[PDB]
């Protein structure tokens, strides 16, 4: 099954950190720090927030440079609904497209039909219903997003707890009430049932938004994520190389408080 | 094990706990006679003035503060950020303050404090909040006003609310306590324990706005077991003298002659 | 060990049973012969209270002694919410359970009876889990998950059974760290919420009540996971109370046997208006 | 002081039941039942409610017939603010005037200045502030009223719990907060302080309103009242003679469940 | 009676001007100008308004200096509800504490229990009910305040007229309506009656707020005050020494238009 193949590709990222990079130098830093993949974008989310202006798919020249600089998978963001941007990214050989809300919405009413592509897609979500709608559209991996570019995990905690609490609610829910639940969260019933049977999201689920410290990243993992995205927390901090390695080690050893303490020690300024 | 942590906190009764952001402030607080220090990144008046996300202190700074003093060292963690508290426990702080002056990490849940071996401080504005924090595992309650304003008005409000509610509860008809516990959304058993003790089941300190010795003795005369001072000492003109004066005020809070003496010639209070 | 757990233990005997409202000894005797596990003595059945209005109070003790004398199964009696003196009287005349009931006229809008002060067990009503746990903390030994009394419409009982059980299933799989906030949100005592989480069920017997008019209704309550059903109006406001009472009892005894449900429903005559 | 003498007169009624009577026959029934006093009025509160129309002080003729019929004290109702009605009641020798809200309000803004009278007054209240305001006007006894003429104790339970909860609040209140409390309930501070010091109301406190059964009456006594008024529950019931004695016995033995059970047995129909 | 003694102390200030001083130089100026007392505070009210920031009891060192610099009585402000601040002021020997609204409220729900102190207190008020509540708390002198630090008498005129008009209303009020009046203004009935019997406030009443010119001060006196407070009008004006003497003479000769004209002539800039 072509979708299950795409899902399997994203499973290989479990336990990893994906780092936003806007040039090839940042891409090397992330790979050396132990990132499982990099995300090519025009500006990290904290700069998109402070500066404003329309944010689009990165120039294919920049993506090519980042692909050449690393051997780990390379993701790239496309505007929501901008399926031509995604066609271009697939054509130049990115490994994943992130149909991303940090870029400027291109279609306020529809997402990309991700089934028309060979490579897997990441989509964001704030709740289970959103996650399942993205998956029905063909998303092979889900980013449970908070607020990008603020260094504040509070919304990612909210959305991780919301998605996982809804899954747990679903696990023990009376079968006969699942139809109404699927109407209530506006999700395809088959995907709701698959989630109930698995007891987890049918695709990999990473946290994203405001992860600024190793404590934050391990928090996301102890809350039940398969990995984390860091967009601004590394490359807007005082010591990106050391913070990047620290966040990777936090995610690999997310239950080991002594390791979390050690990698957090003497880490310099987090992002503003 | 929870009563062990509740008992530990008893050793701070009668004391002043002082916020410190580095080892120099920590030694000043100990020499002034503070019963413990509270390590945080910025004093609350600076967090309020400057904005920005405020998190747990870097472990390196906490280790520095631990090595500078021999009185208990507390540290702040963001509400709900249980991994920050795991780290603070792993580096050997004596108390975690799950603190509202830091940027909220979980808007819906506090830390499950029963999963830790060290005692936790939590803030409250009323009795129901205090009892909820205690049921989560807090061993000590900070009855908080407004952090970083030098204005005790909200601390006075919340101390009178908590203690007024405890006094209400003490004379309350037993049959009305069930509805009372619903009304303040508190665990009934802890409500009953408060009624039977006649005081909060854990140590209760005032915090927020304590700027002068008179403020500090005011909190004690309103029936607190101690006071936090976050900004009043180190945002003031003479930190070393004000810290000793606030400590002496809390130790001698009913002695107007002493209160007048230690307040004399104290310099500028915090802005 | 504790006196409360002894009362809770005693109520277990009622699992699988039907408790029928009776207003005289004739009704009580019919209920016992139909196989009811207990009767509920009250002044008027809920449909009559609803239609007639007026203040509804504890039954006259003479009525209760007549009902106790007529049957050997347990006798329950209704007391107004908050009216602890009515309950003291019911206890002194030897009823087996007091139902602190919303079908009677509320006597204290702000407090329920302190049921821990009594030796005999109490039933209390609830619409949701928080209500149930607050009643249990006050000392209710058994919970009646109530819909609308006297209407013959199960729709609200279904709502409240699904609500209580939905919340229990929600609780069973809930992340432990979220239970403190959950206890606050439903305004329930935390220890009882945790106990409910651990057991996967209500810590006391849970019956459905309100609007159960047919055997299908009763068996529906049982298939939604109740331990038993109250029938107040559906039996004695119907056209054939004796046949209907046996049918509902059989429905609760054999609630998964559709052939039996079909059988006991056949020719049952008119249900309540 | 003259006021404390009046207050002492009403103390002699502790443990008693006061019954509303509209003629000498009812008054004799009440005295024989053991009532500590009777309350002369034109119509029992249940009739005033169902019938409407202006309700005033009883005709002095009817009051004289009631005084001739009994030797226990005779009370009579006067309209709120109607000090001339009270002057008349005093001139014909009633023992207490009840400035009563079950009669038609004569002055919407002022109560009778009860210090200008030699005999003691009863006033109603819903909360402690009302009681203390009535007492400052010269009320020697407070009746804590619910809904008169409905046979429903719910509002009297509310008001008894309100007054008593306020007094218990006041007993443990910080002395410095009492000034603001007296402002909040709009009550004379000296009477608030006196209530705090006594731990109870500075005058006798009876329950009234909706007491229909012996259980109701004993309920009021167990809630902390000194006695009960019964306006409608006796003479609108099926068996007033038996019910009046049962209520009296209930109030005398209000903590004895076996007695309460016994006197409640076979009591006939309560009021509608 | 200890309260009547405190009241008698404040009577000696009748016909006087109390001047705010923030150092010993201002205190001498006020005494030489003929002030009956000085008020030690950290900043005059016009500066507290313009600058903001929390305003507390003056440092006891400053109060000591002001006490040493003058022989007339020395008052000091404490924050409303800050009874420890008042304990300190009593301990260092001020003659009066002003529980003052120009300082930052410390207890939004309660004032200081002034009966626990040996020295008399001043409190502010905007209306009779406030004045009487402060007096019940133990205030021995009342400051009928307008708007401090604006130089605009309009609110002090409003509040002086309000207090005096309410007293005049009370003077001629039907006795039987006084109970309801005391509820309406939320004042202790005994104090309301005392005010009605005296025909004036039971303690000394000074005006305060916006008194900027000798005309203003004499206005307050012709409206019926026993004296005036000047906080900003002297020491924020162009010629404090001359304006201070002028305001004192205005208050001493408040009905003598020729004197008011003379002392107002050539007075330089009033406060901004
Ligand atoms: C969309 C991108 N992959 C991402 O995860 C952004 C995160 O925002 P930040 O809060 O800057 O980590
Ligand atoms: C949370 C911290 N320990 C604290 O007590 C803050 C006090 O606020 P401040 O107003 O700065 O004393
Ligand atoms: C309170 C009584 N036990 C009861 O269950 C009422 C049921 O209502 P109905 O709808 O009449 O069966
Ligand atoms: C005012 C009269 N004495 C009285 O107490 C009325 C009671 O009302 P009811 O509900 O008729 O007892
Ligand atoms: C509180 C002080 N005693 C005072 O009277 C303030 C007056 O204000 P101003 O308007 O500046 O005279």
Curated annotation (Swiss-Prot), chains A, D, E:
UniProt: D-glyceraldehyde 3-phosphate binding residues: 161
In this chain, D-ribose 5-phosphate is annotated as bound at 20, 149, 210, 231-232
Record carries keyword Cytoplasm? yes
* CDD domains documented for this protein: pdxS
Annotated EC: 4.3.3.6
Which cellular components does GO assign to this protein? chloroplast; cytosol; endoplasmic reticulum
* Gene Ontology biological-process entries: pyridoxal phosphate biosynthetic process
- In which tissues is this gene expressed? Expressed in flowers, shoots, leaves and weakly in roots.
Q: List the disulfide bonds.
A: none
Which GO molecular function, any one, fits this protein according to its record? protein heterodimerization activity
The keyword Metal-binding is annotated on this UniProt entry: no
State which pathway it belongs to: Cofactor biosynthesis; pyridoxal 5'-phosphate biosynthesis
Subcellular localization, as worded in the UniProt entry: Cytoplasm
Signal peptide coordinates: none
Q: What is the uppermost EC class here?
A: lyase
**Which SUPFAM superfamilies does its entry note?**
Ribulose-phoshate binding barrel
Q: Report the catalytic activity.
A: aldehydo-D-ribose 5-phosphate + D-glyceraldehyde 3-phosphate + L-glutamine = pyridoxal 5'-phosphate + L-glutamate + phosphate + 3 H2O + H(+)
Question: Could you describe the subunit structure of this protein?
Answer: Homodimer or heterodimer with PDX1.2 or PDX1.3. Interacts with PDX2.
HAMAP family the record matches: PdxS
What is this protein for, i.e. what is its function?
Catalyzes the formation of pyridoxal 5'-phosphate from ribose 5-phosphate (RBP), glyceraldehyde 3-phosphate (G3P) and ammonia. The ammonia is provided by PDX2. Can also use ribulose 5-phosphate and dihydroxyacetone phosphate as substrates, resulting from enzyme-catalyzed isomerization of RBP and G3P, respectively. Also plays an indirect role in resistance to singlet oxygen-generating photosensitizers.
Q: Which family does it belong to?
A: Belongs to the PdxS/SNZ family.
Q: What else is known?
A: Vitamin B6 is an essential quencher of singlet oxygen in plants, that can protect cellular membranes from lipid peroxidation.
User: Under what name is this protein listed?
Assistant: Pyridoxal 5'-phosphate synthase subunit PDX1.1
Q: Which species?
A: Arabidopsis thaliana (Mouse-ear cress)
Q: What is the lineage of its organism?
A: Eukaryota, Viridiplantae, Streptophyta, Embryophyta, Tracheophyta
UniProtKB/Swiss-Prot annotation, chain C:
Which cysteine pairs make disulfide bonds? none
- Where does it primarily localize? cytoplasm
CDD domains per record: pdxS (cd04727)
Top enzyme category: lyase
- The EC designation for this entry is 4.3.3.6
Protein name (Swiss-Prot/TrEMBL): Pyridoxal 5'-phosphate synthase subunit PDX1.1
Q: Which UniProt keywords apply?
A: Acetylation, Cytoplasm, Lyase, Pyridoxal phosphate, Schiff base
State where D-ribose 5-phosphate binds. 21, 150, 211, 232-233
Family, as annotated: Belongs to the PdxS/SNZ family.
Asked whether the keyword Acetylation is assigned, the reply is yes
The biological process GO terms on file are: pyridoxal phosphate biosynthetic process
Listed under subunit, the entry gives: Homodimer or heterodimer with PDX1.2 or PDX1.3. Interacts with PDX2.
Record pathway: Cofactor biosynthesis; pyridoxal 5'-phosphate biosynthesis
The free-text function statement in the UniProt record for this protein reads: Catalyzes the formation of pyridoxal 5'-phosphate from ribose 5-phosphate (RBP), glyceraldehyde 3-phosphate (G3P) and ammonia. The ammonia is provided by PDX2. Can also use ribulose 5-phosphate and dihydroxyacetone phosphate as substrates, resulting from enzyme-catalyzed isomerization of RBP and G3P, respectively. Also plays an indirect role in resistance to singlet oxygen-generating photosensitizers.
Q: Which GO terms describe its cellular component?
A: chloroplast; cytosol; endoplasmic reticulum
Q: In which tissues is it expressed?
A: Expressed in flowers, shoots, leaves and weakly in roots.
Q: Which SUPFAM superfamilies match?
A: Ribulose-phoshate binding barrel (SSF51366)
List ligand-binding residues for D-glyceraldehyde 3-phosphate.
162
Q: Which Pfam families did the record assign?
A: SOR_SNZ
Give this protein's Gene Ontology molecular function annotations: protein heterodimerization activity; pyridoxal 5'-phosphate synthase (glutamine hydrolysing) activity
Name the reaction it catalyses.
aldehydo-D-ribose 5-phosphate + D-glyceraldehyde 3-phosphate + L-glutamine = pyridoxal 5'-phosphate + L-glutamate + phosphate + 3 H2O + H(+)
In this protein, the active site sits at: 78
Kindly give any further remark recorded in the entry.
Answer: Vitamin B6 is an essential quencher of singlet oxygen in plants, that can protect cellular membranes from lipid peroxidation.
């Amino acid at each position: 099954s072509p979708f299950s193949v795409k899902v399997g590709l994203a499973q290989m990222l479990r336990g990893g950190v994906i780092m936003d990079v806007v040039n090839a130098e940042q891409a090397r830093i992330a790979e050396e720090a132990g990132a499982c993949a990099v995300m090519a974008l025009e500006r990290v989310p904290a700069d998109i927030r402070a500066q404003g202006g329309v944010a689009r798919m990165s120039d294919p020249e920049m993506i090519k440079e980042i692909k050449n600089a690393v051997t780990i998978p390379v993701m790239a963001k496309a505007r929501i609904g901008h399926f031509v941007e995604a066609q271009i990214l697939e054509a130049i050989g990115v490994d994943y497209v992130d149909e991303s809300e940090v870029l400027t919405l291109a279609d306020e009413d529809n997402h990309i039909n991700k089934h028309n592509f060979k490579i897997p897609f990441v989509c964001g979500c704030r709740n289970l219903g959103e996650a399942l709608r993205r998956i029905r559209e063909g998303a092979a991996m889900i980013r449970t997003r908070g607020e990008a570019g603020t260094g504040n995990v509070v919304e990612a905690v909210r959305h991780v707890r919301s998605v996982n609490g809804a899954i747990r609610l679903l696990r023990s829910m009376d079968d006969d009430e699942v139809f109404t639940y699927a109407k209530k969260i506006a999700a395809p019933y088959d995907l709701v049932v698959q989630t109930k049977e698995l007891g987890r999201l049918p695709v990999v689920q990473f946290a994203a938004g405001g992860v600024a410290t190793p404590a934050d990243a391990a928090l996301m993992m102890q809350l039940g994520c398969d990995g984390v995205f860091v967009g601004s927390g590394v490359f807007k901090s005082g010591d990106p190389v050391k913070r990047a390695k620290a966040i990777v080690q936090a995610v690999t050893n997310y239950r080991d408080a002594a390791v979390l303490a050690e990698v957090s020690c003497g880490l310099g300024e987090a992002m503003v």
